[PDB]
């Protein structure tokens, strides 16, 4: 058998300037997908005029999105991360607040080391659903480094 459970997954988000020591996400949402990633597309194909095929490299960002329970400490930290303009920090040959997420996916020790990225979008205020329970908040980041997986 193969255990594909997600319980016990932890995320450590460390930013260059906002959170130099980093914080930990462990209270994931109950309705939205706790971690959702768009399919990476690092290659492309083109058709020649003889019916042949050519395969080339194309730029590929990793769009990750983590969902957390509304009102939790992880949600507050992620809102602090979102409400930090890139123009208020100093500049380096690197990216403006380089933030990396270390994902311990299971006790297996997946250790995903997504780095070279930044937060893109997320909810500023909590939305109240029809049922009256505040909807889980999904924050999307983008990354350019997507290697480091173990086991």
């Amino acid at each position: 058998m193969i255990n594909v459970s997600g319980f016990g997954t932890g995320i450590v988000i460390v930013s260059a300037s906002s959170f130099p020591m980093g914080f930990s996400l462990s209270k994931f949402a109950d309705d939205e997908s706790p971690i959702s990633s768009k399919e990476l597309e690092p290659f492309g194909y083109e058709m020649l005029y003889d019916g042949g095929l050519f395969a080339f490299d194309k730029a590929a960002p990793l769009e990750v999105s983590v969902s957390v329970i509304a009102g939790s400490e992880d949600d507050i930290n992620l809102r602090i991360l979102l409400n930090s303009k890139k123009g208020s920090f100093r500049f380096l040959p690197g990216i403006i607040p380089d933030m990396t997420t270390l994902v311990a996916t299971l006790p297996d020790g997946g250790r995903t080391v997504l780095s070279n990225g930044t937060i893109i979008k997320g909810p500023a205020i909590d939305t109240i659903q029809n049922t009256g329970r505040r909807k889980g908040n999904t924050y999307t980041f983008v990354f350019g480094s997507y290697l480091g997986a173990q086991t």
Binding site: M47, L48, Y49, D50, G51
Partner: protein, 81 residues
Amino acid sequence: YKVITRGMVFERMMCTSEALNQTPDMISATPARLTFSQVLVQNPKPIMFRNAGDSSMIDRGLALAEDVVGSAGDLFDYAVN
């Protein structure tokens, strides 16, 4: 050429342009974009004559008759033959 598209006959039609296109979208055949332009003539309906006698006379203007060396003897011998 004369192009008859759909009940619309165009005489005195000459090809002006043509563009062949070879693309992966069509590997067997080739799209082409022909372009003809009409040749303007002073009299679209000319007047002809059936029999060989009765043409209008054509002038050639000045000729500047060119030269040979054959002498009258050769012309005579040719006329004799």
